[PDB]
Amino acid sequence: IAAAVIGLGAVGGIGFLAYAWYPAIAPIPRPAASSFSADAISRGEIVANGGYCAECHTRVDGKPGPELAGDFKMATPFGDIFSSNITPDEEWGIGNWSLAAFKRAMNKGIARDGSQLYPAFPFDHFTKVSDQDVSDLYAYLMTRPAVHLKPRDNTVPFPINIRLIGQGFWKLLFFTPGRYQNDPKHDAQWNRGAYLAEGNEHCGACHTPRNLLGAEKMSSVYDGAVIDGWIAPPLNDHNPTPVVWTEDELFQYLRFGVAPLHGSAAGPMSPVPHRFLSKIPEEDVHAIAHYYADVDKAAQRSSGDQAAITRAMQMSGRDLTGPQPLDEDARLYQGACGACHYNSGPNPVLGRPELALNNALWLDEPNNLYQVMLHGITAEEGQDHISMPSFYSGLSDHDMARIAAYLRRTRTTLPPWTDLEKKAASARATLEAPPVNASH
Amino acid sequence: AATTLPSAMPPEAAFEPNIWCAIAPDGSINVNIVRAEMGQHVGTALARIIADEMDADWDKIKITQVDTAPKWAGKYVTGGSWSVWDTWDTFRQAGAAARSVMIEEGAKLLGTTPDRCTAHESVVSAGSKSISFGDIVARAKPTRTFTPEEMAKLPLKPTGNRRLISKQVPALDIPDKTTGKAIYGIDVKLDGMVYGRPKMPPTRYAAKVISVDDSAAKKIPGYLRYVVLDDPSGIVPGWVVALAKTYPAAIRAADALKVQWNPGPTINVSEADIIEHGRKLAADPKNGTRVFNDKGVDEALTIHPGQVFERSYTCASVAHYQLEPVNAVARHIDGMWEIHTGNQWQSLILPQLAKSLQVPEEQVVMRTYMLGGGFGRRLNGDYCIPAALASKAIGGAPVKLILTRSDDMELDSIRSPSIQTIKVALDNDRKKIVGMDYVAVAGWPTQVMAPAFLATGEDGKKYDPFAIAGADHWYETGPTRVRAISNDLANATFRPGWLRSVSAGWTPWALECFLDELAHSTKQDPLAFRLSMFTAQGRNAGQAPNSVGGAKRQAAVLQRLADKIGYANKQLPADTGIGIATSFGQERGMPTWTAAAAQIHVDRKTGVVTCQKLWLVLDAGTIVDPGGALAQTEGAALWGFSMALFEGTEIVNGTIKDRNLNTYTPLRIPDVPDIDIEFIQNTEKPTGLGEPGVTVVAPAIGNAIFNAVGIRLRHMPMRPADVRRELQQHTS
Amino acid sequence: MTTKFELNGQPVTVDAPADTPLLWVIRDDLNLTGTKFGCGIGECGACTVHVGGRATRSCITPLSAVEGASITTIEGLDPAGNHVVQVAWRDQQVPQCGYCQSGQIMQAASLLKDYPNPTDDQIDGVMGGSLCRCMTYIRIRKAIKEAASRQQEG
Ligand code: PCD
Ligand code: HEC
Ligand code: HEC
Ligand code: HEC
Ligand code: FES
Ligand code: FES
């Protein structure tokens, strides 16, 4: 009371200010591109390709923006956050940044001027990137063409737009700076895979559920989350697909975008194996796959893979062979989807993904199935050279609900979904009619 | 002359003995085909007939699908399976005339009398000397022409064993259809073409446009304008066509148009309402026209009220769903209205097009293209008028009006739901039929589209031949009265249309199911019961040359079926049965005696009915094209199977309920049963084969169901839910 | 706007809205009327084309989805129209009206690429989507089996 409460509040305030406030490194003249060594440029190119630097630092909405120029819109639940320009621009960019300032931003999320960056920039994962990789990718960034584009202004409100207090509190509650620590309990390949997956590649950025404050639930790592309407399925034991995510399946999925059993990488995973993970050394992808196979615990769960595949083959051809005068939802599925989704042989045929094994039918919600039905899969989106028609206008919400209910009842052994029509409408409300086909 | 099928005709003139065939100086022989090529390969069969009669080389035969011209004078009708049957005599006479001219000219060139020279394989010879047809045309240059009455008295060849007829021959149109080179109505491209799409009114008839709001559609790139169709003929009332430079733009513009309508008086009419109106119409004995009314039917029926067996059978609506949606290109070029579309009956729609365009009939010409499946849908021709009106709205510039699947199904002239009541009076022994009373209420497509083609019954009143056909049975049922009643509610609500085997797909259903029910109720064998009434006495004695032998002929095929399937000693496992059903084909004037047997296993739990085997035996006289005949019979049998077990729709709020394949369920490849089709071999006059296969499939299956689980179904299609309901009721 | 892709082995650049279906781009913009328009909702197979050698429905495939891809139509199946599927179709006299037969032939070629020995179950599963209103399925199955046998001979 009085003196005591004032004193303790002042102590807490000065402590929070000392923690949150960071000095601003003096800006340096723009480094010449010739200074950096050629090999460092290639190593930084590999590092930045691994981190998907150009994915969410390029403007996609409206007109396409310049590479690495920022202005990418992120529809955060708290508001809209626009990625900063990381091209070596003198004023609106990192051109005046020094190596120390960029390293500080990578390890702590503090900009050159001392301001704190939002957790939309996943510094909690990039803080594990080693000094050598940081220097390499700084050298790579500083030699990219400069863009004089200014990112648009954020729409985040009070009291979250106040960078100092809000971001300092968020970092205090959840952020833990520090490079990845080598684990002696596992081999070099597993350590490299863990370093990449939890570091540069930040697989848990959208594969781990987040609480109300946007922080990843460390007690539910790789438990699957919801991003952009799609569902990122669990990357651990909790994956509901009947076939285990073996090392070979993981490597195929992460390198070529298609797996022999589970299927192809669509939606938000269209670019990850296609645009980024295919431009990094194959050893890195192999290490990531091995690490996640260890995390997935495939060595114990792989015993039942043959039985699961046989059961899926049995149920894949259900109602697709012989006369079908009884079930009308089965007729709709056969007419609309069964032509390219029927499998008979002991193993699936590449190019005909097995719905009885896919996560779209085994997940808790029909989000992935509805999103695939609506958007479709382009030629280079999932598996290479092959495409999938979009059923935005071919199927109404009722028809999509009928197909989803029939597939869940028949192609899986799980209990039926709930509110399928409302969920179908919600999924449809996130796009803008890919075809002008109509002609219902 | 639009498309010569095997190859283009040589450009060195030709000799035309008549209007049906021409002979080029190089030996090529062109045959003018006026029948629509909707998939039955009619041109190949007609060419076979004319080449066999002409005694010409088949390798020199080409067929031209000619456009509408005054020289053929309303011969462009293709329906009711009349093509081969009607063209038999005409093409035989034409070939005989051409062969006679060739024989005479070859004899003159070779210096011999015509009585000794003989022509074969497109060359006429007299002993050792010989000369081909092309050389004859090049040298003699014949100019003789034959009028139809001149050809009607020529010495035709004997109808026995022929050279080209009843021999396997590849179809002329198949090679083009395999490589995607066949041109349909939807493939037509004209200079300055503008695409168009309609906005369907809420009702088929009596719809009026109040206001149109095109502000939303003006933001669509490529959208030009909208036209509100004013129809002098009143065929497409209340239509609004949106025009664009590209078809997707037209689709989007039509979707974005805001049109206010007066719905009309039939906006809340359901299928049950139509069936109830049919029942009410059939209740009154004075309604309808008696197709034949023998004296004493009432006395026979009412003498013994306790010995009357009556049943009622209903058939639901069926949609064509022809694969190519109805479309047409229209333009006004060189002072003539050109319509490019696939049509089955050009001679019927030409006067309507002329009336709608307010031009003389000689100023309208319809180019002929391959049909993406007619099935009686293209007999309508109501889709050509909106394209012509839209073209007239912009001054005659080409307009390609294409209907989407939803619009095509809304405009579809569906098969009207029908209800038939059959009531017989038996003798004292309850074994023989003494009197018969047949009534059938349905929509009348001929009374709507072609009122001038209505037939006259024994009552002296006009009736639709394509709404009662198949009920004029050949059985010996004593005094028989057959009545056809026109459902005015069906005519007003929608446009009743001709389906494949029109009115012969549901009359045999009721008739054969009723006959089997009566046979089982009187403790009689259905086959023996049917054969005992095939006495072929009276009106069923048969005429010549079409129905030679009368009802006996039908009995023959039935007997053949009873020998093909082992009917006498057929032992089947539990819940398995065999059902038989016979019919005389399409019409009494041109009968195609057919019989069918179905082996059916009925699942007592789910009610699913599976056809293990389907036998068909047909007597269509001479089989001109064995492969074509087999293909047509297979298609017709599968159409009947689909209508009996799979296809079917409903009328909700005055319009068909299903709008695309998401709800409509036609037959697909996995559902095809095992079919065994046999043709009776004889030398009689050929009859139609495209339609008759549909006639007998539906009742037979139903009969088989009664032989499997003992439940009787009197509604088409027979869905598993109905079987489950019947089984649950029988359990009680 | 401008979408560039390889059609029938030739590079083409079509200037059309990215939401335009591949069917109407092929039929109208590229003047290849071999592909046909049926249901329009991807349930009849009349518009089947080959994207990357795999059968797909061009009626509900937007242009933006085939950027830089390889599209094969019925005109590009064989230079002389002597594909094994086409030869089997001609020998068995499968086409009645021929409207579906372009899509049917493309789907049969895709099936033969998938299953070199299509059993009855495989034929039902793969060709179930393709619909023929003329009901030429009896000849379709025989043609598929004959084409498979000829391919195995080869
Ligand atoms: N005898 C004899 C007969 C027949 N044939 C064969 O068969 C066919 C047929 O013929 P005819 O019967 O005559 O028929 P035509 O008339 O031509 O046609 C018509 C029909 O045809 C059918 N079929 C068919 N198919 C197909 N594919 N598609 C179609 O659409 C159709 N349609 C249907 C209908 S219908 Mo009514 O119009 O409805 O009223 S009539 C009808 C021919 O081609 C021939 O070849 C022979 O051989 N023989
Ligand atoms: C999407 C999830 C991102 C990925 C992958 C990477 N970055 Fe990022 N970055 C992102 C956002 C939304 C923001 C803005 C935060 C804010 O406070 O508004 C940033 C910011 C940066 C900065 C700061 C530059 C500035 O002028 O403040 C830098 C230097 C930066 N990001 C670098 C960077 C690198 C090197 C990445 C590859 C490892 C990378 N980012 C990935 C979003 C995302
Ligand atoms: C956000 C953009 C993501 C990042 C970064 C990573 N993943 Fe992901 N992943 C994401 C989505 C939205 C989906 C589902 C889409 C679908 O239709 O497949 C996935 C899917 C996977 C899978 C497939 C699992 C299954 O189908 O059962 C795997 C194995 C996977 N993701 C692994 C993975 C790894 C190893 C990542 C780091 C490199 C990674 N993902 C990043 C979203 C995102
Ligand atoms: C033939 C043209 C198809 C039809 C009709 C349908 N699908 Fe499909 N689907 C097809 C392919 C070739 C692919 C993979 C394409 C690639 O590039 O990734 C897919 C993909 C899916 C998926 C995702 C699985 C994965 O491998 O990513 C799902 C969930 C899916 N398809 C479901 C589905 C449904 C429900 C359909 C009926 C509406 C349907 N597909 C139609 C081929 C074809
Ligand atoms: S039109 Fe594309 S499948 Fe029917
Ligand atoms: S051939 Fe007429 S639709 Fe298949």
Short mmCIF file of N, CA, C and O in Angstrom, two decimals, chain A residues 8 11 22 65 72 135 138 168 171 190-191 193 206 231 237 296 303 331 342 361 366 380-381 397:
data_model
loop_
_atom_site.label_atom_id
_atom_site.label_comp_id
_atom_site.label_asym_id
_atom_site.label_seq_id
_atom_site.Cartn_x
_atom_site.Cartn_y
_atom_site.Cartn_z
N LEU A 8 7.16 -1.53 -5.69
CA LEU A 8 7.16 -2.79 -6.43
C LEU A 8 6.73 -2.57 -7.88
O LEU A 8 7.29 -3.19 -8.80
N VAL A 11 9.69 -1.09 -9.70
CA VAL A 11 10.70 -2.12 -9.94
C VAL A 11 10.28 -3.00 -11.12
O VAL A 11 11.08 -3.29 -12.02
N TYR A 22 15.72 -2.29 -26.50
CA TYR A 22 16.97 -2.70 -27.11
C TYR A 22 17.62 -1.51 -27.80
O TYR A 22 16.92 -0.69 -28.41
N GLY A 65 3.99 -9.09 -56.53
CA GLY A 65 5.03 -8.17 -56.13
C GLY A 65 6.42 -8.67 -56.46
O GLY A 65 6.61 -9.82 -56.87
N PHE A 72 3.78 -8.64 -48.20
CA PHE A 72 2.91 -9.81 -48.18
C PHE A 72 1.93 -9.68 -47.02
O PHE A 72 2.32 -9.36 -45.90
N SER A 135 25.26 -15.71 -41.27
CA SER A 135 26.16 -14.92 -42.11
C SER A 135 25.97 -15.26 -43.59
O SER A 135 25.95 -14.36 -44.44
N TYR A 138 22.68 -13.76 -44.77
CA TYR A 138 22.84 -12.32 -44.85
C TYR A 138 23.58 -11.92 -46.11
O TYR A 138 23.18 -10.98 -46.81
N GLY A 168 7.30 -7.04 -26.14
CA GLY A 168 8.13 -7.42 -25.02
C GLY A 168 7.43 -8.40 -24.10
O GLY A 168 8.03 -9.38 -23.65
N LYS A 171 7.27 -11.81 -25.91
CA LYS A 171 8.56 -12.48 -25.88
C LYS A 171 8.89 -12.98 -24.48
O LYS A 171 9.48 -14.06 -24.33
N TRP A 190 19.97 -37.55 -37.40
CA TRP A 190 18.83 -37.11 -36.61
C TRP A 190 19.04 -35.70 -36.08
O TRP A 190 18.10 -34.89 -36.05
N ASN A 191 20.26 -35.39 -35.63
CA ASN A 191 20.53 -34.05 -35.12
C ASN A 191 20.36 -33.00 -36.22
O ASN A 191 19.80 -31.93 -35.99
N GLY A 193 18.45 -33.30 -38.89
CA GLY A 193 17.03 -33.21 -39.18
C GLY A 193 16.28 -32.39 -38.15
O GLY A 193 15.40 -31.59 -38.49
N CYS A 206 3.23 -23.95 -38.68
CA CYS A 206 1.82 -24.17 -38.97
C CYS A 206 1.39 -25.62 -38.78
O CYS A 206 0.27 -25.98 -39.14
N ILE A 231 -6.24 -27.83 -42.98
CA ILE A 231 -5.79 -28.45 -41.75
C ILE A 231 -4.42 -29.07 -42.01
O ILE A 231 -4.28 -29.90 -42.91
N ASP A 237 2.83 -39.33 -33.60
CA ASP A 237 2.03 -40.54 -33.43
C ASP A 237 0.55 -40.27 -33.68
O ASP A 237 -0.16 -41.13 -34.22
N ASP A 296 7.66 -39.47 -35.52
CA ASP A 296 6.42 -40.17 -35.83
C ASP A 296 6.37 -41.55 -35.19
O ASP A 296 5.28 -42.10 -35.03
N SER A 303 4.29 -52.05 -38.51
CA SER A 303 3.92 -53.45 -38.63
C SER A 303 2.58 -53.63 -39.33
O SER A 303 2.42 -54.53 -40.16
N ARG A 331 -23.72 -43.29 -55.90
CA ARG A 331 -23.82 -42.98 -57.32
C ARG A 331 -23.20 -41.63 -57.63
O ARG A 331 -22.49 -41.47 -58.62
N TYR A 342 -10.33 -44.68 -58.00
CA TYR A 342 -10.57 -46.10 -57.76
C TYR A 342 -9.25 -46.85 -57.80
O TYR A 342 -8.47 -46.68 -58.73
N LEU A 361 -9.85 -37.70 -45.40
CA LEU A 361 -10.99 -38.45 -44.89
C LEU A 361 -10.79 -38.94 -43.46
O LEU A 361 -11.77 -39.34 -42.82
N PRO A 366 -13.64 -32.07 -42.00
CA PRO A 366 -13.55 -32.26 -43.45
C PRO A 366 -12.88 -31.11 -44.17
O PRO A 366 -13.06 -30.96 -45.39
N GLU A 380 1.13 -28.28 -61.45
CA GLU A 380 2.36 -28.31 -60.66
C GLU A 380 2.11 -28.10 -59.18
O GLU A 380 3.06 -27.89 -58.42
N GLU A 381 0.85 -28.16 -58.73
CA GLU A 381 0.55 -27.91 -57.32
C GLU A 381 0.95 -29.10 -56.46
O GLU A 381 1.76 -28.96 -55.53
N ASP A 397 -23.26 -27.12 -51.87
CA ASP A 397 -22.91 -27.46 -50.50
C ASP A 397 -23.55 -28.76 -50.07
O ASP A 397 -22.92 -29.58 -49.39
#
